[PDB]
Amino acid sequence: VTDPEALLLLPRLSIQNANAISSPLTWGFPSPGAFTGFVHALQRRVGISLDIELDGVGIVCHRFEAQISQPAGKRTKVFNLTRNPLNRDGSTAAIVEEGRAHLEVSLLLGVHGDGLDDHPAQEIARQVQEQAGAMRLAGGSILPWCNERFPAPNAELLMLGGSDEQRRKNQRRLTRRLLPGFALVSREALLQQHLETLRTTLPEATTLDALLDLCRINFEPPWQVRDKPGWLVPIPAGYNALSPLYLPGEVRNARDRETPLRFVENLFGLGEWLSPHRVAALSDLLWYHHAEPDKGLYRWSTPRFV
Amino acid sequence: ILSTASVLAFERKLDPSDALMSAGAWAQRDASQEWPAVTVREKSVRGTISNRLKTKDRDPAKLDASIQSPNLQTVDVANLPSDADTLKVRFTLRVLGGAGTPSACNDAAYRDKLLQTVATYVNDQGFAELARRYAHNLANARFLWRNRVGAEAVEVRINHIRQGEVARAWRFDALAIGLRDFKADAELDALAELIASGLSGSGHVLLEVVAFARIGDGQEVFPSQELILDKGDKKGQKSKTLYSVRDAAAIHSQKIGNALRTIDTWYPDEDGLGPIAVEPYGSVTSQGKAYRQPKQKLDFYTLLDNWVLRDEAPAVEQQHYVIANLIRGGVFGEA
Amino acid sequence: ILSTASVLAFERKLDPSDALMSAGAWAQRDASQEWPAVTVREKSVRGTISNRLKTKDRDPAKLDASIQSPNLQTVDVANLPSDADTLKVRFTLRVLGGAGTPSACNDAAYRDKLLQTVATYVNDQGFAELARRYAHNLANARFLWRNRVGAEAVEVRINHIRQGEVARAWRFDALAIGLRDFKADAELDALAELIASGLSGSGHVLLEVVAFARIGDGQEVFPSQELILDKGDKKGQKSKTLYSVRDAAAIHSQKIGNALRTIDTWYPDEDGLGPIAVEPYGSVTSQGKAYRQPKQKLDFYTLLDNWVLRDEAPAVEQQHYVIANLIRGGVFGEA
Amino acid sequence: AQICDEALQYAARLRELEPGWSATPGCQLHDAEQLWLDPLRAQTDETFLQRRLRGDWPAEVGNRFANWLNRAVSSDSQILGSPEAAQWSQELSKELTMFKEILEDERD
Amino acid sequence: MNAIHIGPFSITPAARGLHYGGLPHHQWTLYYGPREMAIKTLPDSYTSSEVRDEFSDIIAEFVIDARHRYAPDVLELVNSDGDAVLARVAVSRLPEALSGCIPDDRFPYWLLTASRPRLGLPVTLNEYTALAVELSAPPLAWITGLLPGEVLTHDAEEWRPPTSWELRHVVGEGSFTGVSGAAAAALLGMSATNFRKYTAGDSAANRQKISFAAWHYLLDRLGVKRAS
């Protein structure tokens, strides 16, 4: 919703057991809403004391490992589980299938505020790094890099460049820092135009079928494969309204009785993983919240991408 | 009903060793036991367009653009040293015998009938015309394939190595004994009876064959050429690879055996070409055609099936061709 | 029905050996038997940036940073010894014959028609003009390519070896025999008659050609340049290597053969430049322009097809060119 | 573009290897590409090879990769006769210009 | 459990049984003729259908391989220049007049072979139709690669009757031609049971051998041989 005055690079963060089930329809890399919520929790915890705002997160995902296995005779996969403790009668409890993933991601954070002029860049960078080293990113603990060879501090780069060439060199150096990974971006325009292409191909086609067609490998008879522009993952694109926004004390057993609750349904969109050298600026990769609370639509996206 | 056996594999008689190439000088061939071997070296070739264009590369601009991108290659080359004009080729030939007996035969009764057919052949005429023609191919250096088309003088020495020592020596002139005529000579007849005793089963025959060719000082000698995997870059393409055994150029053994096999003159086509190799359906790779077609009923299989199954014995020339194929050997019978 | 054969592989005639390079002094050439061979050596070069820039390297500071880092190579150079102003180059040439007979062919009818066409050509006008032009290309040191360009005096000796001994010696003077004029000389007619006897199959011809060029004391000679795989570093990048056989710099045999093939003065463009090489589509790689384009129907393939199939015999110089292409050999046919 | 992206990605995981693997002994180890293969050997050698990558600024290696990319094109004369080869060479030159510019500022 | 006969293939399980993990299993082997192919251990619980579809991959692979192995030759009708191919015909047997050939400007049409060594003949269009009529390959001619030369000869003295396996290539079930036993019976003009004596082997009872004319007419109707 705003252009960041600076970009803070949180380095390689090893998230231990992240929620591999991103959505009721998708598994794998966690939701971008988890990353945006983590950055908002960082702004809630240490952002206010530094007189800065932390909005917008760019994910690089340097490493992914899924705690999964492939059973013999099946082409699908299953989630490795954890043994929950027994009940009070000594019996095994009912198992809820929860999957885990070891992530290694680096985050670009959009920083704007007067506190950037009040503190050194390395000071606020080290403060938000030591705050983020005791938090969670998708349900997993963050490994804070103890007793390895060379630890990685941040590099907060001011986006108000004095010259266009110096700004370009800064963005290319920051892209070179986060090199072995893929920027995950939102593709609402690509999914909508593919929906229009399928509607010209066949009418009454929903956005779900256009999302599904952009993920399966289509085999065409003369036997070739229908190509895709990018990786084109199905991402959770936010939450849509399923109920009116009830009063803060209205909903029974809410998390807090001061925040209003509204039952939601998952919104599914198309995301794309790209090499981060294929972007004009690294501020395009930032994932922003977008509530629009009168109509539900509690989305996260990448505005100012293309 | 005495049908043909489904499996009729035959072992080859007249097994040649790999023909090692060395380099040397004329009149030193009586002491050519220390001669340095011909080494397969490398040289770079730059080429322009010299093939037929398929009516789309015939435009002047496209042809000139193809000229400005020459095809650079590296070729394995075999040349004599500048003080060496003589190319020496040495191989051993082992004559086994028992050409009637197949290595594999499904039908006993067919095996007995084929053995009786070969026995009645040998009782009619032994391994004497075939051994004479094989001895003629020994005497001329037909195993020197392209190292004889421009050779000034070729000489072949054949030794009978009985107990690791020369039991009988023969020296020949490979240019006087041509590649066309199967004449008669006393030393050629003695080598014919030696190959006859080897092929019948009278004794063990091992022949050491040494060849000397007056090509020229530093000229290119032609070994057998290998097969190219075609994996590297187009600059160092390695279009041609020659055959060597231990840092030493050589001819393939089956090439020597095919050149000794070149005795078949009884094919139904004319004698304008001369002898061809004794193949089933009389195939010649250079001419790209098959003498002794199955349509003209003079291939090996029709002649053998008439000779064995229904006792229709062919002419003695076709009998020689059939027994020469049995000496040559192969996977006969239906797969 | 006489279609052109799909394969028409021709063995090359005028087979040259690899031309070894040694160095010495002038008028010691008669004692040039044990001259020290030219050895390829290494020398280091650093260079300024001197190619044409693409309008973005033309900035002053960026070009300044370019010249501040000169590029480094190790080039193989071939130089004479300082007590040597004369370069000796030795090769042998084999004249085979049977120029119209392909080594590999598909259609026997087309092969017989091409053989009859070549025999008809030999019948009216035998191998005399082509052999005279090849004698001229032996007479001038065209195989000393950049290697007689700045020579004060060039001399060529062509000896005829019969039984390991010299038969006819042809001492020449390559300054008199020009690189453009195909005149007549009695010794050149004698060499033409010898190459005529070799090309017609009358006898075996092996010629030892030695060229002495007076370049300068310790100057640069120009052997054949090889191909570099570029598997080293960038400082010692080895950007240029020169060809040698055994610690002795030399010229490639195909370069000598392309030098002897430069007899083609009958290309449809202007011949004031001089002779070009015998080749299909008349393609010289220095000019980058093909004379005898297939548009003008003066190339080898159109003339050969018109001569053999349609029996449209071309101009006499053009059938000289066609038979010279058959002498040089090729992979004519479908490619 | 995706292919040269993966080349950078390959170099990216070459940042995960040993600091001095390029200094090991060997007859052939692609020393022309070794200035970009191992950027960390400038930490290993103070002046033996650290100044070499700075002075040389190796950006021609992608041209070698372009040669490998020239093995990714079809061997069709219809493309070479028409302007399809011209468009292929234009987009190849633009993308390896971007690749060489990426490889130029590796020293920062 | 027992062998599943799919095409000429037999999925024969092993008599012995094992219990990998906590489940029973069986060594199932795919036989093409007397030759085994791909072998996989299938759990006893697996259904016969599961077994078949499981090996279906190997089955399909073999079929594809065979088709490629015996793909018929193809002659090209080209113009005088020879670079442009106006027509392509899948030949059954190459003509007996073609030789090393390349199209010449003299003749407008030339027939050539698909291989590099282009052997051919200069023919007009009516002779091209005549050659295409007498030497065309039927659509399922590749199965003639899998059949021996004795069962495909047109001479009765050299003709050998097909076995149960050789007939079972192309009669019923998941065959290479895809037809059923009743369809192959209706092609030959007789009822299903008389063809079932031809298909079923084992003992000499209900093992009448198919005649030469009936076998060649069946090959004609299935588009495998002689179907121009």
Q: Which residue of E has its CA nearest to B295?
A: E96
Number of domains in chain A: 2
Whether residue D81 and residue B233 make contact (CB cut-off 8 A), yes or no, is: no
Q: What is the DSSP string of E74-90?
A: EEEEE-SSSSSEEEEEE
Nearest chain D CA: its distance from B64 CA (Å) = 12
Asked if residue C288 and residue C143 are part of one domain, the reply reads no
Whether residue D12 and residue A169 make contact (CB cut-off 8 A), yes or no, is: no
Nearest chain E CA: its distance from C6 CA (Å) = 5
Backbone phi, then psi, for D41, in 5-degree steps? -70, -20
DSSP A294: G
End-to-end CA distance of chain D: give it in Å, rounded: 23
Residue E168: other Cβ atoms inside 10 A: 20
Q: Which domain holds residue B199?
A: 12-98+127-262
Q: From CA D22, how far away is CA C233, in angstroms rounded?
A: 12
Q: From CA E159, how far away is CA E149, in angstroms rounded?
A: 9
Whether residue D81 and residue B59 make contact (CB cut-off 8 A), yes or no, is: yes
* Chain B residues close to E99, C-beta within 8 Å: 289
Which chains are adjacent to chain B, needing at least 3 Cβ pairs under 8 Å? C, D, E
To 5 degrees, how large is the angle CA A60–CA A63–CA A66?
120
Interface size, chain C vs chain D, as Cβ–Cβ contacts under 8 Å: 18
Helix, strand or coil for residue D48?
coil
CA distance to D34, D51, E49, per residue, from C233 (Å): 9, 15, 63
Q: Which amino acid is at E29?
A: T
Interface test with C, best of B74, B152, B291 (most C CBs within 10 A): B152
User: Of all helices (H) and strands (E), which one includes residue B168?
Assistant: strand B166-173
Whether residue D81 and residue B62 make contact (CB cut-off 8 A), yes or no, is: yes
Do the beta carbons of residue C271 and residue C265 sit within 8 Å? Answer: yes
Q: From CA E144, how far away is CA E66, in angstroms rounded?
A: 10
Domain end: A165, A181, A197, which one?
A181
Q: Which domain holds residue D40?
A: 1-108
E4: number of CA atoms within 13 Å, CB side? Answer: 19
Tokens of B254: 């089956």
CA distance to A104, A188, B126, per residue, from A231 (Å): 19, 14, 78
Do the beta carbons of residue B25 and residue B84 sit within 8 Å? Answer: yes
Partner-chain residue, chosen from E83, E100, E150, that has the shortest CB–CB distance to B56: E83
Q: What is the DSSP string of B279-327?
A: -GGGEETTTTEESS-TTTT-SHHHHHHHHHTS-----HHHHHHHHHHHH
- Tokens 């995301």 sit on residue: A271
Q: From CA D82, how far away is CA E150, in angstroms rounded?
A: 53
Nearest chain B CA: its distance from D70 CA (Å) = 11
To 5 degrees, how large is the angle CA A3–CA A277–CA D69?
160
Q: What is the DSSP string of B191-240?
A: HHHHHHHHHHTSS-EEEEEEEEEE--TTPBP---B------S-STT---B
Q: From CA C280, how far away is CA C274, in angstroms rounded?
A: 17
Asked if residue A164 and residue A22 are part of one domain, the reply reads yes
CA distance to A191, B103, B311, B328, per residue, from B98 (Å): 79, 10, 22, 12
Which residues are CB-contacts of E29 (< 8 A; sequence separation ≥ 6)? E11, E12, E13, E14, E36, E37, E39
Whether residue B62 and residue D80 make contact (CB cut-off 8 A), yes or no, is: yes
End-to-end CA distance of chain B: give it in Å, rounded: 20
* Chain D residues close to C239, C-beta within 8 Å: none
Q: Which residue of D has its CA nearest to B59?
A: D81
Report the DSSP beta bridge partners of residue E3: none
Q: From CA E28, how far away is CA E30, in angstroms rounded?
A: 7
Please report how the helices B129-139 and B253-260 are oriented relative to each other, as an axis angle in degrees rounded to 10. Answer: 120
Q: What is the DSSP string of B246-281?
A: SSSBEE-HHHHHHHHTEEE--SSS-TTS--EE--GG
Asked if residue C251 and residue C222 are part of one domain, the reply reads yes
* Chain E residues close to C5, C-beta within 8 Å: 99-102
Q: From CA B299, how far away is CA B316, in angstroms rounded?
A: 14
Whether residue B55 and residue E148 make contact (CB cut-off 8 A), yes or no, is: no
Asked if residue A174 and residue A64 are part of one domain, the reply reads yes
Whether residue B56 and residue D81 make contact (CB cut-off 8 A), yes or no, is: yes
> Under the phi-then-psi rule, with left for phi > 0, alpha for psi from -120 to 50, and beta for the rest, what region is C317?
alpha
Helix, strand or coil for residue A295?
helix
Q: Is A82 exposed, middle or buried (0-12, 13-18, 19+ CB in 10 A)?
A: exposed
Backbone phi, then psi, for C21, in 5-degree steps? -115, 125
Residue B32: other Cβ atoms inside 10 A: 17
- Confirm or reject contact between D103 and chain A (CB < 8 A): no
Q: What is the DSSP string of C55-115?
A: SSS--HHHHHHHHTS-EEEEEEEEE--TT--EEEEEEEEEE---TTS-SEES-HHHHHHHH
Whether residue E96 and residue B55 make contact (CB cut-off 8 A), yes or no, is: no
Q: From CA E29, how far away is CA E38, in angstroms rounded?
A: 6
Do the beta carbons of residue C333 and residue E102 sit within 8 Å? Answer: yes
Whether residue B62 and residue D67 make contact (CB cut-off 8 A), yes or no, is: no
Whether residue C295 and residue B60 make contact (CB cut-off 8 A), yes or no, is: yes
* Chain B residues close to E81, C-beta within 8 Å: 54-55
Asked if residue A133 and residue A213 are part of one domain, the reply reads no
- Confirm or reject contact between D67 and chain B (CB < 8 A): yes
Which chains are adjacent to chain E, needing at least 3 Cβ pairs under 8 Å? B, C
Burial E67-78 (b: 16+ CB within 10 A, else e): beeeebeebbbb
Nearest chain B CA: its distance from D80 CA (Å) = 9
A212: number of CA atoms within 13 Å, CB side? Answer: 6
Q: From CA C152, how far away is CA A270, in angstroms rounded?
A: 79
Q: From CA B296, how far away is CA B302, in angstroms rounded?
A: 10
Number of H helices, E strands in chain E: 7, 9
Q: From CA C106, how far away is CA C108, in angstroms rounded?
A: 6
Helix, strand or coil for residue A281?
coil
> Under the phi-then-psi rule, with left for phi > 0, alpha for psi from -120 to 50, and beta for the rest, what region is B196?
alpha
Q: Which amino acid is at D75?
A: S
Number of domains in chain D: 1
Per DSSP (E only), the strands in A154-206 are: 157-158, 183-186
- Strands B250-251, C250-251: pairing kind: unpaired
Nearest residue to C41 (alpha-carbon basis) of C16, C78, C94, C13: C78
End-to-end CA distance of chain E: give it in Å, rounded: 44
Asked if residue A160 and residue A202 are part of one domain, the reply reads no
Asked if residue B191 and residue B284 are part of one domain, the reply reads no
Asked if residue C284 and residue C332 are part of one domain, the reply reads yes
Q: Which domain holds residue A101?
A: 4-181
Asked if residue C288 and residue C244 are part of one domain, the reply reads no
Do the beta carbons of residue E164 and residue E171 sit within 8 Å? Answer: no
Q: Which residues in chain B are followed by a discontinuity, with C-to-N distance exceeding 2.5 angstroms?
A: none
Which residues are CB-contacts of C104 (< 8 A; sequence separation ≥ 6)? B285, B286, B288, C7, C8, C9
Report the DSSP beta bridge partners of residue A299: A238, A290
Domain end: C209, C230, C262, which one?
C262
- Strands A264-274, A233-241: pairing kind: antiparallel
Partner-chain residue, chosen from B55, B288, B335, that has the shortest CB–CB distance to E81: B55
Asked if residue C232 and residue C215 are part of one domain, the reply reads yes
Do the beta carbons of residue A61 and residue A184 sit within 8 Å? Answer: yes
Note every long-range contact of E176-184, with CB atoms under 8 Å and residues 24 or more positions apart, other chains counting.
E176/E7, E176/E8, E176/E63, E176/E66, E176/E140, E176/E143, E176/E146, E177/E140, E177/E143, E177/E222, E177/E223, E177/E224, E179/E222, E184/E218, E184/E222
Partner-chain residue, chosen from D2, D12, D108, that has the shortest CB–CB distance to A179: D12
Which chains are adjacent to chain C, needing at least 3 Cβ pairs under 8 Å? B, D, E
Q: From CA B143, how far away is CA B252, in angstroms rounded?
A: 10
Asked if residue B258 and residue B319 are part of one domain, the reply reads no
Asked if residue C321 and residue C216 are part of one domain, the reply reads no
Q: From CA C67, how far away is CA E204, in angstroms rounded?
A: 95
Residue E87: other Cβ atoms inside 10 A: 13
Whether residue C69 and residue D56 make contact (CB cut-off 8 A), yes or no, is: yes
Which residues are CB-contacts of A83 (< 8 A; sequence separation ≥ 6)? none
Asked if residue B110 and residue B53 are part of one domain, the reply reads no
Whether residue B56 and residue D77 make contact (CB cut-off 8 A), yes or no, is: yes
Interface size, chain A vs chain D, as Cβ–Cβ contacts under 8 Å: 31
Burial B193-223 (b: 16+ CB within 10 A, else e): bbbbbbbbeeeebbbbbbbbbbbbbbbbbbb
Interface test with D, best of C67, C233, C238, C239 (most D CBs within 10 A): C233
Q: What are the strands of the beta sheet with C7-10, ordered from one edge?
A: C104-105, C7-10, C330-333
Q: Is C7 exposed, middle or buried (0-12, 13-18, 19+ CB in 10 A)?
A: buried
Q: Is D28 exposed, middle or buried (0-12, 13-18, 19+ CB in 10 A)?
A: exposed
To 5 degrees, how large is the angle CA C11–CA C17–CA C21?
155
Whether residue C234 and residue D32 make contact (CB cut-off 8 A), yes or no, is: yes
Report the DSSP beta bridge partners of residue E81: none
Nearest chain C CA: its distance from D106 CA (Å) = 17
Whether residue B54 and residue E83 make contact (CB cut-off 8 A), yes or no, is: yes
To 5 degrees, how large is the angle CA E30–CA E34–CA E36?
30
DSSP C265: -
Tokens of C314: 């071309």
Q: What is the DSSP string of C309-330?
A: TS-----HHHHHHHHHHHHH-E
Residue B150: other Cβ atoms inside 10 A: 24
Which chains are adjacent to chain D, needing at least 3 Cβ pairs under 8 Å? A, B, C
- Confirm or reject contact between C54 and chain D (CB < 8 A): no
Do the beta carbons of residue C43 and residue C74 sit within 8 Å? Answer: yes
Whether residue E100 and residue C1 make contact (CB cut-off 8 A), yes or no, is: no
Which residues are CB-contacts of A296 (< 8 A; sequence separation ≥ 6)? A239, A240, A241, A242, A262, A264
Whether residue C335 and residue B150 make contact (CB cut-off 8 A), yes or no, is: no
B111: number of CA atoms within 13 Å, CB side? Answer: 13
Sign of torsion over alpha carbons B173, B176, B182, B183: negative
- Strands A298-301, A100-112: pairing kind: unpaired
Tokens of B156: 């072949």
Do the beta carbons of residue B69 and residue B172 sit within 8 Å? Answer: no
* Chain D residues close to A180, C-beta within 8 Å: 9, 12-13, 15-16
Residue E106: other Cβ atoms inside 10 A: 15
Helices (H), E70-191: 125-135, 143-146, 164-168, 181-188
Chain C and chain B touch, per 3+ beta carbon pairs within 8 A: yes
DSSP A45: I
Asked if residue A83 and residue A13 are part of one domain, the reply reads yes
CA distance to B85, B217, C103, C203, C204, per residue, from B151 (Å): 10, 12, 16, 11, 8
Do the beta carbons of residue B243 and residue B252 sit within 8 Å? Answer: yes
- Strands A224-225, A219-220: pairing kind: antiparallel
Partner-chain residue, chosen from E99, E100, E106, that has the shortest CB–CB distance to C310: E106
Helix, strand or coil for residue A107?
strand
Q: From CA D76, how far away is CA A83, in angstroms rounded?
A: 61
Nearest residue to E69 (alpha-carbon basis) of E61, E57, E77: E61
Domain end: C262, C281, C297, which one?
C262
Tokens of E36: 């085994």
Asked if residue C255 and residue C325 are part of one domain, the reply reads no
C311 CA to centre of own chain: 32
Domain end: B244, B262, B280, which one?
B262
* Chain A residues close to D105, C-beta within 8 Å: 169, 172-173
Do the beta carbons of residue C334 and residue C7 sit within 8 Å? Answer: yes
Domain end: A148, A181, A214, which one?
A181
Interface test with B, best of E83, E110, E113, E147 (most B CBs within 10 A): E83
Backbone phi, then psi, for A201, in 5-degree steps? -70, -50
To one decimal, the resolution in angstroms is 3.5
Asked if residue C179 and residue C284 are part of one domain, the reply reads no
Q: From CA A235, how far away is CA A242, in angstroms rounded?
A: 20
Q: From CA C83, how far away is CA C69, in angstroms rounded?
A: 37
Residue A106: other Cβ atoms inside 10 A: 21
CA distance to B291, C1, C2, C303, C334, per residue, from E119 (Å): 17, 13, 12, 22, 10
End-to-end CA distance of chain C: give it in Å, rounded: 22
- When computed from its CA atoms, the radius of gyration of chain B, rounded to whole angstroms, is 23
Q: From CA A126, how far away is CA A153, in angstroms rounded?
A: 7
For chain B, list residues whose CB is within 8 angstroms of any CB belonging to chain C.
26-27, 41, 43-46, 48-53, 58-60, 63-64, 67-68, 70, 72, 74, 79, 81-82, 85, 146, 149-150, 152, 215-220, 235-236, 285-289
Tokens of E22: 């906590």
Asked if residue C104 and residue C58 are part of one domain, the reply reads no
B206: number of CA atoms within 13 Å, CB side? Answer: 10
Q: From CA A302, how far away is CA A110, in angstroms rounded?
A: 12
Residue A109: other Cβ atoms inside 10 A: 27
Nearest residue to E123 (alpha-carbon basis) of E91, E86, E98, E144: E98
Q: From CA E6, how far away is CA C193, in angstroms rounded?
A: 78
Whether residue E99 and residue C107 make contact (CB cut-off 8 A), yes or no, is: yes
E68: number of CA atoms within 13 Å, CB side? Answer: 6
Backbone phi, then psi, for A299, in 5-degree steps? -100, 160
Partner-chain residue, chosen from A180, A274, A277, that has the shortest CB–CB distance to D102: A277
